[PDB]
Write a protein that binds this ligand. Structure first.
Ligand SMILES: [Mg+2]
Ligand SMILES: [Mg+2]
Ligand code: NA
Ligand code: NA
Ligand code: NA
Ligand code: NA
Lengths: 1015, 210
């Protein structure tokens, strides 16, 4: 029947003999064990070494495999994705389905994973009760055999599938056979922008329940107006034979103190003309002054559900963590415990670079710690129900969770072809209903999502209403079909911009500020995805947070996204390197578009993370005279683990510092009077820096953690002092090909044919490997490239406009190069034009003034043709001969910062190793810029002025020619790019021009000045 | 002390080039010990009789953003027409210049003065690349106003009818000029993007007889 029916090409069959979905069960037979959440003897893990064999299709699986092992099969760890063991290739595609679009059909060559296990079952488990098997995640469909006999079938890769093995097992040794199909009709609903993998990738376990059992339970908490009183309501369902002596006791615990308890026999209230539920009971417990759950303070109670006899024999106990909180939308605002949330969110896929889509406790905890340490309070499960432990960790550490159904049909044309089709409602409904049945008791889940990128169909409307009917405690959101459809409680667009409308036909992305006030619109707006963090990105992040703080109904969003989906590969020498789409023979593919994370796959932060941390701060600051105003954006907690440190420095040199404990009520303000600061004698800008430090460790952070910061300019004393007049005069020497200038042990050489400083000598040692030349281009960022699909070429993308305009191949043409000997200086004057096929793109006019003190003052004035696309940068570059260990600068830092991503950086004196000045983006691009720099030091060289710079062993040319960071090789010496001006990086999205007008280099005429000397 | 700041000469040197003379100057404007502004200039006079002026100004970050960054002088010439390539024909300011068009404009001198009943800074034209008056020509990228009334007289005279034409012509040429505002007239109303807060400013002019 199995090969004949082909259930994996039938949307009408999504399971066979699968048990009902339910909240997490452990079937404790001791109440104390239930309460303390200790291991249960009735719940056994089948994780470990299994038997695996790969096949090109199910028809190729030998019928012998059912009853007996294949010796040709291997021993592999489970859970795993089989692509991660090398059996076939993982495929990275974004939108286009990895299979031909022919629903419900999949390719006849359907890779097939044959898993099997031989295991002991104790006698006690089969004498009395029910033994079930639980597959927490099987991608994407599977048939199950126990001791050669067919048990059942299941679909949906991201929710547990459970089967009764009571009638299938024997005492002692047993054998499981699992035939896992890579592709199924379920794949049509699994078109998420991620690696396409397969296998038993989540836990496998055996659960023993008694015949008379708790089959389901629901916990609700409702409140009075001021949350000083709560009612916990627990509905409990049983299976087995009903008896008058049966009871349920629900007890609520706060640590070791029992706070409330209810006991009742079965038999619900009358429901309709036929009576009520004889097999159900609802317990209601009163709780006075409940400790409320939030992301700020994740207060939890323990609920123990005891099924027992009237005289007190425990039959079984189940349990869960309870967080007392109310989530509601009122008057257009999303409220938690009566207060309007500000969502500091991020989307997080389940990704590990070594293990694929297999999740472990350590990686989950690592992710939560880093998130909270970087001022995140929310996570969206993009785009499927997560590993069950994630919710437990979000409950306990405190994160707001959007729980999202495993439905994405992005590749369909139009996007709603399946979701508007009633024939697909059954499959869709199970992906929604079984998620709610599983996760409804987790306090961390505050919002349900209907899926992702599946357009808007009638099926969405039906399932929206289903959830609203079944669970009134949580808003339902869904972005599909324009982000404000009838299927969503929250306007939840992806990549809508702050001020700029994007008026796409049918599905426009309005400016978020404008969207709120559209005629008849009343809902809150929280972006399901925003600030696409692909490569060198998060430009304009501050614009979002400014808008979120100003507009009540703008209640935040979820950054896209948390972690780069790069996978480890190994080179000929066995050295690891990070791979993206196409690196596994996978084709078609969408290349580096799988990497959009704030952190690298190994959880090392990108530079963008610090910008997010700074903008997502929970304390806001204002300065007025000597007074610092600190405002709390906590809704519930007082600042009881916070102190404010302050320091004033003069151009990097500390002058005064202090600290003040913070005592701010939620939403309150605190005024801090700075003591009288003594005047500095010398010239320069005074800077004030404040930092909020957490003196104590928490569950999520170490002692001394910095949670917030801010900087201001105080008094500036402009230098009016004349630099000491030197008694030396530089000497000019002229030849046909060069102007040379000599002063002491220093020498400068200007090539009269090129018009550039071609060489510079200190003690007759050459300082340059490549002449100092104007640069107007950058190795393009992912945002410049502007691609979401590797097949799509966009003439509007920044890189394409630069290329078409000839910016990357325009060559300097000399117009003028003269030298004049002055009183105490030599003055070199140059002028250049850059031209492409007849058109003058840029003109650079310069003077170089070399005086008797050894300083070379460079003045640069650039003209940019108004009709050429605005250039990426306006500056100089050269290859220095020296490699030095340290880079020392007075400017914004310490981390990489760009004009539209520099709010997090502080002005100060920074000193880093040279390697830190390079950001190892997996797809190489322009990187490591530091802005607002007044002084740069490298070896014996010092540059002064007001510039942006980067400094590394990799040229812009190598960066733009190299597709992977591991293929980069250090060049001789050090490439220095010093910019007077640099274009923003953008990032509102990464598949269209996203650099805001105020960060484009459109002024037409530009001026900057640099002093180069030796210290 | 913006209105009473006194210039203090820091540097004034002369250099001979192959085909030009180069004058270099530096001034500090101070009020009671505090340096408000520093102006560093070069004047380059060549064989064609053109005087190229570069101006680089530092503005102390803790001084209120200044109304303008420019040069002024009282010309001896009184001429009948003012001819410019820039935004016009009417008075226009950085935050009120959208109506104005870029073209060649030619107006009688009196049209370059706006007779506001309460006298103030008036008659600016922005985005100007070339200005002509009598024997003079100025080229660059600047804002200017030109009239028989000095800024000093305008700020000391309460009514337009009490204004007297001064000797010659007062010329104000700005690299930069603050917005005028007006969201209301009883509180600061100049938007941040039109305030002169950049700290360091560059502009350049070529002055010649045409
Ligand atoms: Mg099927
Ligand atoms: Mg998609
Ligand atoms: Na808001
Ligand atoms: Na992506
Ligand atoms: Na590249
Ligand atoms: Na007046």
């Amino acid at each position: 029947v199995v090969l004949q029916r082909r259930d994996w090409e039938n949307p009408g069959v999504t399971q066979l003999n699968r048990l009902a979905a339910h909240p997490p069960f452990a079937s404790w037979r001791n109440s104390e064990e239930a309460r303390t959440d200790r291991p249960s003897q009735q719940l056994r893990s089948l994780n470990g070494e299994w038997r695996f064999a790969w096949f090109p299709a199910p028809e190729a699986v030998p019928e012998s495999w059912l009853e007996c092992d294949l010796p040709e099969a291997d021993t592999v760890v489970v859970p795993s994705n089989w692509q991660m063991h090398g059996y076939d290739a993982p495929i990275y595609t974004n939108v286009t389905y990895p299979i031909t679009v022919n629903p419900p059909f999949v390719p006849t060559e359907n890779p097939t994973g044959c898993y099997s296990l031989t295991f002991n079952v104790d006698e006690s488990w089969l004498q009395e009760g029910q033994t079930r098997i639980i597959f927490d995640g099987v991608n994407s469909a599977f048939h199950l055999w126990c001791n050669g006999r067919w048990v059942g079938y299941g679909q949906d890769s991201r929710l547990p599938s459970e089967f009764d093995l009571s009638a299938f097992l024997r005492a002692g040794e047993n054998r499981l056979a699992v035939m896992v199909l890579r592709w199924s009709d379920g794949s049509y609903l699994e078109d998420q922008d991620m690696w396409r993998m397969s296998g038993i990738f989540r836990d496998v376990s055996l659960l023993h329940k008694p015949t008379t059992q708790i089959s389901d339970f629901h916990v609700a908490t409702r409140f009075n107006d001021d949350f000083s009183r709560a009612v916990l309501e627990a509905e409990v369902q049983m299976c087995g034979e009903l008896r008058d002596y049966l009871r349920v006791t629900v007890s609520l615990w706060q640590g070791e103190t029992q706070v409330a308890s209810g006991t009742a026999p079965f038999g619900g209230e009358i429901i309709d003309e036929r009576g009520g539920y004889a097999d159900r009971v609802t317990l209601r417990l009163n709780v006075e002054n409940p400790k409320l759950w939030s992301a700020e303070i994740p207060n939890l109670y323990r609920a123990v559900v005891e099924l027992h006899t009237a005289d007190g024999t425990l039959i079984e106990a189940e349990a869960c963590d309870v967080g007392f909180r109310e989530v509601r939308i009122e008057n257009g605002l999303l409220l938690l415990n009566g207060k309007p949330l500000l969502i500091r969110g991020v989307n997080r896929h389940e990704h590990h670079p070594l293990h694929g889509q297999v999740m472990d406790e350590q990686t989950m905890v690592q992710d939560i710690l880093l998130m909270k340490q970087n001022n995140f309070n929310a996570v969206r499960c993009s785009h499927y129900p997560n590993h069950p432990l994630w919710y437990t960790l979000c409950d306990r550490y405190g994160l707001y969770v959007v729980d999202e159904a495993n439905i994405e049909t992005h590749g369909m044309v139009p996007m709603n072809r399946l979701t508007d089709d009633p024939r697909w409602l059954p499959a869709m409904s199970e992906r929604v209903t079984r998620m709610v049945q599983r996760d409804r008791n987790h306090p961390s889940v505050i919002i349900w999502s209907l899926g992702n990128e599946s357009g808007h169909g009638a099926n969405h409307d039906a399932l929206y209403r289903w959830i609203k009917s079944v669970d009134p405690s949580r808003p339902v959101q869904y972005e599909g079909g324009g982000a404000d459809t009838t299927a969503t409680d929250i306007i939840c667009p992806m990549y809508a911009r702050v001020d700029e409308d994007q008026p796409f036909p049918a599905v426009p992305k309005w400016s978020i500020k404008k969207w709120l006030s559209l005629p008849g619109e009343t809902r809150p707006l929280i972006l399901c995805e925003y600030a696409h963090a692909m490569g060198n990105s998060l430009g304009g992040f501050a614009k979002y947070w400014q808008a979120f703080r100003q507009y009540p109904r703008l209640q935040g969003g979820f950054v896209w996204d948390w972690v780069d989906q790069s996978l480890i590969k190994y080179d000929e020498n066995g050295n690891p390197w990070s791979a993206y789409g196409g690196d596994f023979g996978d084709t078609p593919n969408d290349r580096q578009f799988c990497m959009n994370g704030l952190v690298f796959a190994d959880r090392t932060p990108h530079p963008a993370l610090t910008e997010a941390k700074h903008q997502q701060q929970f304390f806001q600051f204002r300065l007025s005279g000597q007074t610092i105003e600190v405002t709390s954006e906590y809704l519930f907690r007082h600042s009881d683990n916070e102190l404010l440190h302050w320091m004033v420095a003069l151009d990097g040199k500390p002058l005064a510092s202090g600290e003040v404990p913070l005592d701010v009520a939620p939403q309150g303000k605190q005024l801090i009077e700075l003591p009288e600061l003594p005047q500095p004698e010398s010239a320069g800008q005074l800077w004030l820096t404040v930092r909020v430090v957490q003196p104590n460790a928490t569950a999520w952070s170490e002692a001394g953690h910095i949670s917030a910061w801010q900087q201001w300019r105080l008094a500036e004393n402009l230098s009016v002092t004349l630099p000491a007049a030197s008694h030396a005069i530089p000497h000019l020497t002229t030849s046909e090909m060069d102007f040379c200038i000599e002063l002491g042990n220093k020498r400068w050489q200007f090539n009269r044919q090129s018009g550039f400083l071609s060489q510079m000598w200190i003690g007759d040692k050459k300082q340059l490997l490549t002449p100092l030349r104007d640069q107007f281009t950058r190795a393009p960022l992912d945002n410049d490239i502007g691609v979401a699909e590797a097949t799509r070429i966009d003439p509007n993308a920044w890189v394409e406009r630069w290329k078409a305009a000839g910016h990357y191949q325009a060559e300097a043409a000399l117009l003028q190069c003269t030298a004049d000997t002055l009183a105490d200086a030599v003055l070199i004057t140059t002028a250049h034009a850059w031209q492409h096929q007849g058109k003058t793109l840029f003109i650079s006019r310069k003077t170089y003034r070399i005086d008797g003190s050894g300083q070379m003052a460079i003045t640069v004035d650039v003209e940019v043709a108004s009709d050429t696309p605005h250039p990426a940068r306006i500056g100089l570059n050269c290859q220095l001969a020296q490699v030095a260990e340290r880079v020392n600068w007075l400017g914004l830092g310490p981390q990489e910062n760009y004009p539209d991503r520099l709010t997090a950086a502080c002005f100060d004196r920074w000193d880093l190793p040279l390697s830190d000045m390079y950001t190892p983006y997996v797809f190489p691009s322009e990187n490591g810029l530091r802005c607002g720099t007044r002084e740069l030091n490298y070896g014996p060289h010092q540059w002064r002025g007001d510039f942006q710079f980067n400094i590394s062993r990799y040229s812009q040319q190598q960066l733009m020619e190299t597709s992977h960071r591991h293929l980069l090789h250090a060049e001789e010496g050090t490439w220095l790019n010093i910019d007077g001006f640099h274009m923003g990086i953008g990032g509102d999205d990464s598949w269209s021009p996203s650099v805001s007008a105020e960060f484009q280099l459109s002024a037409g005429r530009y001026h900057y000045q640099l002093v180069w000397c030796q210290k």
